[PDB]
Each structure stands twice: as C-alpha cells, then as structure tokens.
Ligand binder design. Structure first.
Ligand SMILES: C=C(O[C@H]1[C@@H](O)[C@@H](CO)O[C@H](OP(=O)(O)OP(=O)(O)OC[C@H]2O[C@@H](n3ccc(=O)[nH]c3=O)[C@H](O)[C@@H]2O)[C@@H]1NC(C)=O)C(=O)O
Ligand SMILES: CC(=O)N[C@H]1[C@@H](OP(=O)(O)OP(=O)(O)OC[C@H]2O[C@@H](n3ccc(=O)[nH]c3=O)[C@H](O)[C@@H]2O)O[C@H](CO)[C@H](O)[C@@H]1O
Ligand SMILES: [Mg+2]
Length: 419
C-alpha cells in the first residue's frame, strides 16, 4: 500500500503547472454520455477519480481513450447500469443517472451509501429528475430511473445549493422537451464549465454562474473539443503550501477568478499576491502566516475543499484562528492527525478553534479525505523531521502527481511502495 515519506522543514520555492480541474472533468465526462458524436476533452488531470470515471464510462459501452486529453465516444452506449462495486468507491458515479435517462429513457445507478466526510444524501438528484418526468424506483440498492420518451422541462427550485444536483438537473435538461429553469442553483466554476461544454455540443443554456440557470431542450448533442478549466483547489493547495513555508512560488495554467475567497484569505494571512491572466504569484517574504478565520460556503465563498489546508495554515500561524464548516459538518478527520504532529486545536461542532504553534513534528499520520488529506502532506513539508502519510490512495484521487509537483518546489518527499 502506497505511502508518503516526507521530510522537513522546507521552504517551498519555484514553479508549478496547475492541472485541469478534477471537479470539472468529472461532470464533463458524465455529460459526454449525452454526446452523440466523438468528443475531445482537453486538459484532464491524471488521477484516480478520472480512472474510475473512465472505467465507468466503459461499462456503459463508451469508447474511451487518453494521453493530456480524453477521447470520448458514446455513440454506442449499450449498458445503463453503474454497478455497486464501482459506485462504492466514488459517489460521483451518480452523475451517470441523468444523462443516461435523459438520452436513453433509462438508467440505473447503485444508490451511494455512507462517506467518511459525513452525511451526503442525493435526495436532490432524484427530486430533480422526477420534476423532469423521470419515473424513479429503488431495486436492491439500485436507483432505477425511467422515462417514456423525452423528459419535460420544468421550473425547479433547489432546497439546498448543490453542485451535484445542479449538474444532474442541468445535464439531463439539455435533451428535455421544453424549458427548464434551475432556481437556487450552484454557482461553482465547475458548473459553468460543464455548461459551456454542453453549449459547445450544441445545447442551449444560459445563466451558468448565476443562481438561475435556464436550459432550452434540443434535439440532440453533437461532438466537439472542449478545454477544462484549471483546478482551483490544486492552486489554492499550492498557494497555501508556499504560504506556510515562507515560500516564493508561481502558478502556471491558472484562473485567478476562482480563488477570490482563498486569495483574499491568503493576503489576509500575510502574503504578497500578484496575478495575471493565467498565473498567480505568491511570496511570503520570509514571514510566518497570521491566523485567519474561515467559513466554508457555496462559491464564491470559501470552499470546503480548501478548509483543511487553511486549518493547517492556522496551526502554524501566529494567533488564534477559527475554521467553521457549513457544507460538511464532519470534515475534520485531519485535526486529530495534525494534533499528533504537535498542533493545538479544539473542536466544537462545525467549528474548530486553532492555536498556532512554532513548530510541527514529524510523525505517522493517516489520510482519509481525497482533498483534506493533502493538508497532511503539506504538514510534513514544514514540520520538523519525518512524517509518514498512510493511505495516500486518497490523495491520488484528487491530485495529479502531487509528489512531483512538490518536489519541483524543494519538498523532500518520497513515495513508498511497500506498506
Ligand atoms: C469531496 C469532493 O468535492 C466535493 C465538494 O467540493 C463539494 C462542495 O460542496 O461539491 C461536490 O460534491 P457534492 O456532493 O456534489 O456537493 P453538494 O451537492 O454541493 O453538497 C453540498 C451540501 O448539500 C448536501 N446535499 C447535496 C445533495 C442532495 O441531494 N442533498 C443534500 O443534502 C450535502 O450532503 C452537503 O451537506 C465536490 N465533488 C465533486 C465530484 O464535484 C471531492 O473532491 O470529491
Ligand atoms: C484496502 C484498504 O485499506 N482501503 C481500500 C478502501 O479505502 P477506504 O477504506 O478509505 O474506504 P471507502 O471509500 O471504501 O470508505 C470510506 C468510509 O465510508 C464508508 N462507506 C463506503 C462505501 C459504502 O458504500 N458505504 C460506507 O459506509 C466506510 O465504512 C468508510 O468508513 O476502498 C478503496 C475503494 O473504495 C480502495 O480499495 C482502498 O484501497
Ligand atoms: Mg470513499
């Protein structure tokens, strides 16, 4: 079982090329199920989640190929069920439900059980589909959606702001009969890209990025070539990494207007931030970060995907910092791990109180979150001594060659094959 052997402290410095967003390519790939023609998706990150989604697509009859881009061919989808064995490793699998029923009149997807980050029902998805005409049922764990002919456009208002359910409703609405309006929709950059992608295929969508997305059903979807946006999370992760190490870094292949909250939080912390059309520079000028307060929430607010990272930041910052989760009240696994490393923190419900310390100690930790767990690696880079990160399989899910990227920064990280 893979593991990380990290040794610090280390002052991160240098250059890094941000990969395509993981959370953009996922819904985009699932969206390709609709495409009736070959599709070329560019800038796809090399990561576990992508492997999983590619494999899933294959199970449906989709022709798949890959390098920097992914070659998708759905012309011959012959299967409509996403197997329990696969969904149980990636809840995102549910993304195949809407496209499948929207285009085929049918589709089945193992109903996702629990997740370590906490409660994550998919109620909004089904609900969203029913409103479109989908006749949905639950057989032996499988979500069975079925529609007689095309789906009908409807006026849907969302109980919660949900990236997942917005993509489900949006995507399926492209092939529906009539007009669909998603009120109280997610405004995540990844939603905008999934829509842009869809539009490129010949779909009719407006309002992407706003709280009101409008979809105009069409006959069918062609093929084409789309370019996935840069991963905002990766970037924020790299930025934080430099910011907690007194680093001086540059971000290539970026999109600054997706980090406003992170960017501002960083400046607040005390870093020197400059940005360009597709780049972002950060220089700590040899300074220890200043504690900051964070409140996760739907974009464009602070993203929970950066939450753990910022928690780390506060752990070694001067002052009392506060992190409050409003998206995943249980996304704290990292804390007890970082505390093993000499960190001081208190947990009160969805909030963690931070007490910065002068140093961190190398020790044995355990990853458990495909994104929060990165904080663990970041921790080992600035901590004193050797940190062994267990279960890095998590990180390989949301990070393309993370050790390589870190290494190009001066990090003393090594991958270990034998448990
Ligand atoms: C971890 C990762 O990233 C996830 C987080 O970044 C999250 C940010 O919210 O959004 C997406 O998951 P999500 O599941 O789609 O995100 P919500 O629907 O927005 O969930 C936000 C809140 O909404 C509740 N909710 C959601 C749907 C529903 O039907 N019912 C319902 O109650 C939910 O349980 C939360 O309490 C991301 N995953 C992907 C694959 O894109 C990762 O990289 O894998
Ligand atoms: C061998 C090992 O040590 N870990 C494996 C396990 O990682 P993990 O053990 O990290 O977990 P997982 O993703 O299977 O489960 C994460 C958490 O969710 C819970 N959960 C998960 C799925 C579900 O349908 N219901 C549910 O309740 C589970 O009890 C655990 O607390 O699985 C992965 C695929 O998923 C890989 O095979 C990992 O190598
Ligand atoms: Mg899991």
């Amino acid at each position: 079982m893979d593991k990380f052997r990290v040794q610090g402290p280390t002052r991160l410095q240098g250059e890094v090329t941000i990969s395509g967003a993981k959370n953009a390519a996922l819904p985009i790939l699932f969206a390709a199920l609709l495409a009736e023609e070959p599709v070329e998706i560019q800038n796809v990150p090399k990561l576990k989640d992508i492997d999983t989604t590619m494999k899933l697509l294959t199970q449906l009859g989709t022709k798949v190929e890959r390098x920097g881009s992914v070659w998708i061919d759905a012309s011959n989808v012959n299967n409509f069920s996403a197997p329990y064995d696969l969904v149980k490793t990636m809840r995102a699998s549910i993304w195949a439900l809407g496209p499948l029923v929207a285009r085929f009149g049918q589709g089945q997807v193992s109903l996702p059980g629990g997740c370590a980050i906490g409660a994550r029902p998919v109620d909004l998805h089904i609900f969203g589909l029913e409103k479109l005409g989908a006749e949905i049922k639950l057989e032996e764990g499988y979500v069975k959606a079925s529609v007689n002919g095309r789906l009908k456009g409807a006026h849907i208002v969302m109980d919660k702001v949900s990236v997942g359910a917005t993509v489900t409703i949006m995507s399926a609405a492209t092939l529906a009969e009539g007009t669909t309006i998603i009120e109280n929709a997610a405004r995540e950059p990844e939603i905008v890209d999934t829509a842009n992608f869809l539009v490129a295929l010949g779909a009719k969508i407006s309002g992407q990025g706003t709280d009101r997305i409008t979809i105009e059903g069409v006959e069918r979807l062609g093929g084409g070539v789309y370019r996935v946006l840069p991963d905002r999370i990766e970037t924020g992760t790299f930025l934080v990494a430099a910011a907690i190490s007194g680093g001086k870094i540059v971000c290539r292949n970026a999109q600054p207007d997706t980090l406003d909250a992170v960017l501002a939080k960083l400046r607040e912390a005390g870093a020197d931030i400059e940005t360009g059309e597709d780049w972002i520079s950060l220089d700590m000028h040899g300074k220890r970060p200043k504690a900051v307060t964070v409140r996760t929430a739907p974009h464009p607010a602070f993203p929970t995907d950066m939450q753990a990272q910022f928690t780390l930041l506060n752990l070694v910052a001067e002052g009392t910092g506060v992190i409050t989760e409003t998206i995943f009240e249980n996304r704290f696994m990292h804390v007890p791990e970082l505390i093993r490393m000499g960190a001081h923190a208190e947990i009160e419900s969805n909030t963690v109180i931070c007490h910065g310390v002068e140093k961190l100690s190398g020790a044995q930790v355990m990853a458990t979150d495909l994104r929060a767990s990165a904080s663990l690696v970041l921790a080992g880079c600035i901590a004193e001594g050797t940190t062994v990160v267990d279960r890095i399989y998590h990180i390989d899910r949301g990070y393309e060659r993370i050790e390589d990227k870190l290494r190009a920064l001066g990090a003393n990280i090594e991958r270990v094959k034998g448990e």
